[PDB]
């Protein structure tokens, strides 16, 4: 009895993260193979860490503030932001984050897509 | 009311169109379509649920593409392919289609899952 939705996420070519805001600092509790190929990290290097580690010297603080404020308000956000592979290579990340609420309205998870749009935006 | 499945919410909330089909029902019908798929194609959930994904094909669709998909599905193998499909509006578009079979622990086919993406502009160069 395999979960078809889990397999959807495991097999898609679109990078995806799930985080758990009931653990301290809202850490990644799942990253799909697409995310690990994109960024160069192993699963054990990203699980248990906040997604912040993708940010670096080029990252616009205005982008980071907007994400922080949407997460605190438990609201979704779409935004392009400069992020960094483990190698150190910069890329433009088209980032989509959505909160996941209980039936009772209690925040449970966050889920995200990430898409390298370096070539698109280079135009 | 149970804790909500994070992976189901991942697929419901992503902007990437996705379908799940059930090959143990007759004609391998769609049993889940995410809102991204309904935005892409223009259909309501009740117009696509319970149907084979074939309904997206039309006069422009290359039968060679359809044969290749049919043969991959019968062999329970994945396929990546661009194919002409049709929105409910009638507009034709290039669909970058990614299909994967989903196996049991025992290796028995259980579901198929797909991504779909309008790549009309990319392919138009
Ligand atoms: C599910 C999820 C995925 C995230 N993915 C990214 C990401 O791909 N890149 C990034 O720069 N920040 C990402 N973030 C944002 C950071 O984790 C963090 O929330 C951001 O830096 C704002 O907060 P801070 O000031 O506490 O670091 C993600 C956040 C969540 C909830
Ligand atoms: C999970 C899944 C998703 C599919 N999505 C599409 C789609 O978006 N577009 C399409 O043209 N065919 C799609 N198909 C392929 C058709 O449903 C069908 O298998 C194909 O037309 C070949 O078989 P046929 O000769 O019976 O029509 C999908 C099939 C599966 C299993």
Numbering used by the authors:
A (entry chain B): 19 to 141
B (entry chain A): 17 to 141
From the manuscript:
LOV-HK is a blue light photoreceptor from Brucella abortus, a pathogenic α-2-proteobacterium that can be transmitted from cattle to humans causing brucellosis. B. abortus LOV-HK comprises an N-terminal blue light-sensing LOV domain, a central PAS (Per-Arnt-Sim) domain of unknown function and a C-terminal HK domain. Upon blue light illumination, B. abortus LOV-HK photobleaches as a result of the adduct formation between its flavin mononucleotide (FMN) chromophore and an adjacent conserved cysteine residue as in other LOV proteins.
The blue light sensing LOV domain is flanked by α helices at both its N and C termini, denoted the Nα and Jα helices, respectively. We crystallized and obtained the structure of a “blind” construct consisting of the Nα helix, half of the Jα helix, and the LOV core (LOVN13J21 C69S). The structure reveals a parallel dimer, in which the Nα helices intertwine and interact with the β sheet of the core. The Nα helix plays a central role in the dimer formation, interacting with the hydrophobic β-sheet. In contrast, the addition of the Nα helix (LOVN13J21 construct) strongly promotes the dimer formation. In addition, the presence of the Nα helix dramatically increases the lifetime of the light state in LOVN13J21, with no detectable decay for at least 30 h after light excitation, while the light states of both LOVJ5 and LOVJ20 slowly decay in hours. Taken together, these results demonstrate that the Nα helix plays an essential role in forming a parallel dimer.
